[PDB]
């Protein structure tokens with residue numbers, strides 16, 4: 001009489017799974033030509049990015065987003081899409097428009113939005 005056993009069902013498994021294959025596709029060798037910088041966290045030291053810490057308050061990398069997935073730390077794809085768009089925005093936030101890394105970020109983001117938006 002009380003027992004509701006109610007909840008927005010799983011399916012999000014199918015989301016986070018689909019959110020996966022995206023990233024798995026995002027790591028693809030064909031997209032390597034512009035995905036490789038974003039594979040691992042930016043080495044401000046090795047890259048000498050003196051002010052990247054003062055600006056990028058919440059840096060993100062594809063490797064970092066990948067770990068949260070395996071950790072089931074993402075509630076849903078919207079959380080998942082946020083870290084990704086968090087990754088790019090930093091590329092946009094830190095550097096000038098005409099820079100190459102932005103161009104690499106954009107073509108990578110283009111692949112993302114297509115598969116991402118075409119989730120059911």
Ligand SMILES: O=C(NO)c1ccc(-c2csc3c(=O)cc(N4CCOCC4)oc23)cc1
Pocket residue numbers: 036037038042047090091094095099101
């Ligand atoms: O040379 C490399 N590996 O051997 C390398 C280079 C760049 C990155 C990278 C990924 S994201 C990101 C970023 O946000 C801004 C910047 N810059 C802003 C100035 O132009 C050159 C760099 O470096 C990155 C990662 C690895």
